[PDB]
From a paper:
Protein synthesis is essential across the tree of life and undertaken by the highly conserved macromolecular complex of ‘the ribosome’. mRNA translation is regulated at many levels, but until recently the ribosome itself was not thought to be part of this control system. Here, we have characterised ribosomal protein heterogeneity across 4 tissues of Drosophila melanogaster. We find that testes and ovaries contain the most heterogeneous ribosome populations, which occurs through a combination of paralog-enrichment and paralog-switching. We have solved the cryo-EM structures of three different ribosome complexes purified from complex in vivo tissues; 80S ribosomes from the testis (3.5 Å), 80S ribosomes from the ovary (3.0 Å) and polysomal ribosomes from the testis (4.9 Å), improving the resolution from the only other previous ribosome from D. melanogaster.
We performed a similar experiment with ovary 80S ribosome preparations, collecting a dataset containing ∼200 000 particles, and resulting in an average 3.0 Å resolution (Supplementary S10D–F). Comparison of the testis and ovary 80S models revealed that the main difference between them is at the P- and E-sites. While the ovary 80S average did not contain any densities in this region, the testis 80S average contained densities that did not correspond to a tRNA (circle). The IFRD1 density was not present in the ovary 80S structure, suggesting far fewer ribosomes are inactive by this mechanism in the ovary. Specifically, the three switched paralogs (RpL22-like and RpL37b in testis 80S; and RpS5b in ovary 80S) showed the largest differences in their atomic models out of all paralogs. The importance of the paralog-switching event between RpS5a and RpS5b has recently been functionally characterised in the Drosophila ovary. RpS5b specifically binds to mRNAs encoding proteins with functions enriched for mitochondrial and metabolic GO terms in the ovary, suggesting ovary RpS5b containing ribosomes translate this specific pool of mRNAs.
Numbering used by the authors:
A (entry chain AX): 1 to 143
B (entry chain AN): 2 to 151
C (entry chain AW): 2 to 130
Write the structure that this text describes.
Amino acid sequence: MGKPRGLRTARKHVNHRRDQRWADKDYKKAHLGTRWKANPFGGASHAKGIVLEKVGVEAKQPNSAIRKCVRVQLIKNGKKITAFVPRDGSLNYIEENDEVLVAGFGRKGHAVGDIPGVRFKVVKVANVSLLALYKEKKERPRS
Amino acid sequence: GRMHAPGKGISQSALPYRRTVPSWLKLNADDVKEQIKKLGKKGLTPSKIGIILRDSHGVAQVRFVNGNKILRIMKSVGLKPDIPEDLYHMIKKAVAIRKHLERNRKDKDGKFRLILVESRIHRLARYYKTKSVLPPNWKYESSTASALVA
Amino acid sequence: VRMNVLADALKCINNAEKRGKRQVLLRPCSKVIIKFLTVMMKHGYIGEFEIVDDHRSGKIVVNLTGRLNKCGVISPRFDVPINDIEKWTNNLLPSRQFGYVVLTTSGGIMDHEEARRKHLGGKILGFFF
RNA sequence: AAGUUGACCGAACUUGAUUAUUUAGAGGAAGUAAAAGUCGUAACAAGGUUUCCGUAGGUGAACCUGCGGAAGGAUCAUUA
RNA sequence: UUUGAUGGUAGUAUCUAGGACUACCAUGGUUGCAACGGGUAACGGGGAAUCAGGGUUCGAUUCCGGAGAGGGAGCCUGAGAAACGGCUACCACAUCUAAGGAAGGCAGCAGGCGCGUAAAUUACCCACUCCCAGCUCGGGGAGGUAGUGACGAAAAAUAACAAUACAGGACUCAUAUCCGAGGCCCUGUAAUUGGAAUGAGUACACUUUAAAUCCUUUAACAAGGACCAAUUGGAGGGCAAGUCUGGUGCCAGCAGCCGCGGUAAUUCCAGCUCCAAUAGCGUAUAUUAAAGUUGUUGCGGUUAAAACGUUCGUAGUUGAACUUGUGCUUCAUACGUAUGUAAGCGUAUUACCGGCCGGUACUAUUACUUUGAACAAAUUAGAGUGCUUAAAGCAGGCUUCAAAUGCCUGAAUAUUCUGUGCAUGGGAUAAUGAAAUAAGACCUCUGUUCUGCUUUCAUUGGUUUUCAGAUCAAGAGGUAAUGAUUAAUAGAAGCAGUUUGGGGGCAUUAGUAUUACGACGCGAGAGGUGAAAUUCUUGGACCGUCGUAAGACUAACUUAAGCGAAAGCAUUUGCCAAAGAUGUUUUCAUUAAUCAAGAACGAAAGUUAGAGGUUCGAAGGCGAUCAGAUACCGCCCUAGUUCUAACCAUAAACGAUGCCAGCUAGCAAUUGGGUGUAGCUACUUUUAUGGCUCUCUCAGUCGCUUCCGGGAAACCAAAGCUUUUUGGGCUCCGGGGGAAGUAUGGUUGCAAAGCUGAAACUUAAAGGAAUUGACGGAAGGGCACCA
């Protein structure tokens, strides 16, 4: 539908797809500079930080469980975010103000499931690799 | 059809396949020379000479009785117009819409019909300045125009 | 207005054979389009057509068999060299058994089997199978 | 050789303007989540005043009313 | 563009051109084909990642090029540097100092701090490849070489062969969804046990190398699982895999999404098992494919997101047909047939000599296309080849176990460096070009006019003619078929044209009505409503009647009619200008198509400034109803409706459907025009006309019926011809839902507001057409003493 089918319309065609790529939500997400201004991660996969408080997120209904998140301030630009910790245990293994390594959750930035707003996930705490201390292959130091 | 109107109706002349008929003509074929210009001296545009000779002579089509057309025969005599005919009548219309509008304003649908006829004087001017029967520096200015056509 | 005579006389063929008429009237027969049907005539698809000669532009009353399936035109007439002549037979024609893409090469109007042996390139003029 | 006179390249700081970002703010006002609060029932059934639109005014709130439009209507309509 | 911007001119300056710099003149130069400005998480290119193609993303990174050494500037020597492993200063950081002063730049190789999600040894030698010096020999953290190294690629430990033990189906056969014997062409579980192999290690020596290490080569050692002991994820679906057992009880938690979990959990946590890939695999971010969800190939826009309200209109994009096409004669050539190479007629497809053949004079153009030229390698494509194979590598192989300058051949060809530019063939397609009262061609070759200069006037000078290499114009009156394609079921314009239409403007004019008043009769009611009340009767109302006056609105006729670009348009009559259509052996000759920007019009409401001011009537004020009622209903009313002169620019401005063009079907009506109906038919007499009748015909518009149609359907002669990802051209718009047509900037406006127009955050659905139930101020047709 539409498009000019003449011989010398290469000017209009490359103008149009440049004009109309700015309606696509996936193109324009990566072409606006907000992987540093809006992303509290520094345009990257992981980040490190220092925690503040261990809190209970009320899950979105139909499901109903307090979700045991952690609100952390990452040291890269001082922004204060909230991360989720998996695999029950996981908060008697934290002992607040230990240095944590934080990653994403999986849906390419935005939130995922029953937990509203929480987009990041704790990977290591005090260097000892939280998924491995959950199965007690590593122990968090008492120092 | 109709660049400035919706109505797509088709109607024209249907010229036949045979060319040199009349096979019954009273005089010379080229004695329409001295009746193209003898009625060209009465100020008749060649549309009116193409139909005044359909009924007295009565010639069918001039470009088969002679070699070439009616407008070319007149400037072979030397009666070509100062402005060609499809601009002479297209401007005399746009003159008359302005003279109707210098007394009957509140009329936004005679005004619209002026923008139509002025947007196509500018299309026959933009062509006649290419094929070089109008010179350049020839525009439609509507303050001199009424002394051209009258 | 008619920016192609070749489109306004090949859809006019193709619309009149899906209804299965035996004669199509096309208008107004550019000599481009006569030598397009002459490619289609000598491969069986078209009967011996007749050119009515009125001295305005011409008319043709083209006989046909019923072997045609889709006989359209490509526009705009893309210049095709010989090395990219098979990118236009692959994605267009149904199989490489049969069908043709007609070219206006530098020598004449010919299909894509005679041009690849005579080693000529040109513009795409249309297609039929 | 020092030193010098005049030109020319010109760092640099001081001031003004010009951009291009980022940030503190009394108050104000919109949005989202949060169903489980209050008040009424706006809409969908002729949702009990058919609805919607543009535009103005009015009203605790959904809304109301005028003027014009549309059917996405509750009439494809039978009335020489 | 003052303060060089664009050019001229003379200069200076430099190695040299040049506004590079100066002085004087000139006013240029770039621009919607995107200049200028901004951003860049930008060093450019070779190349890299990923796909069937078309492609998207990346390239700090070993190769070429640019660039720079904390920040800027300056500069010396030098053929070469605006050099920083050179200097000078300023700025910022640091250093030593006996306080006077002196020196410093690791974005060289190592190493330390720091920042960080994010990156190794303060090792060894110039044997290699080359570079430099006075130069066989010196130097070179260039370079090679070990140590770290799960970035990434390649080849592959974690068993194998049998025995009985217990065991399966199957093979023969008693027998046949029962059953024995040879249990067996079977495989498992066996700390039964007993055997065969072995590299993993290990260790002499060796080869290795600059000296080494490792691998390869290796004399001695080295397997019985209890060990030389493979783990990472998952077992609801998507997705190959326990409806296993205990635990917990919408808890703990799990889950990419859908979904699980509420004292039986196939989804949690564990046990017992199982399934995938395997020295691997899981997670996070990015990116490609998936994606026909960015659509050139290849989407969508009636209703799902989406045709600008309307039409003009420049840039742009697209543009009707037409020109030497072939025929014969042939022969060369697949089998009387087939020319597919060519030759002979359409008056001359370029003039000479050479022995059909070469030098040779002469080439309307561009795009396209053929084959070329031309140019880095690595990569890539990939030829060849037993590094044992492999990814690689550019070697190697042979006679041959040899003696043996003793041989043999390597070390391809291409995409790429896609395009530009050049050479050559072609001349289909597509533009431009030419000859108009001829500054047309050859000719009238006339000498009327030429231009010029090297050969000879012994040498050298004067008188001056010819060939004049060439170049202007010919004695012009004569010899050239002496030159203008069609006229588009394209457009435009005309017409002695006949009309036609609620088209627009201005006057004029009519119709009843609704008021409001004036008379007169009447007598107590009247408005209204679900019921009311407000309200009108100082009775003279209501009603009846004649009236006068004013402002509105143009009924009925009124249609599935018409006109108009759209919004819109209805009393006659006059005048004004314009329009479609039909007719036309009229005229011109491609003038056309569509369209950013820009223009003109744009219902209602709202706004200004006057004139009006009946009806109606937001707002306001009362009366009811109602739990409430700022509403619906009822009364007087205000802004407004009205007219003028401006503004505004939006409507469900809808057919939720852009415009020009071609095609594709029935059936019936009507608007307009044309043409044959002595078809009728009004009467001057029939005729001329008018009315209709059927019969045609244009442009249609309606209507209905179904396609060889299409679509998710509803449905539509277009919304079809969107074949088998298709192609007539042009333009606009959409990319899940919200936040939001918000914020903000700009622009328009007197204001109201209009045209532009995001993101944060949030979300697993929102939506379309249809189906069954629900069976309600939904109509229809029926039933019952639980009516």
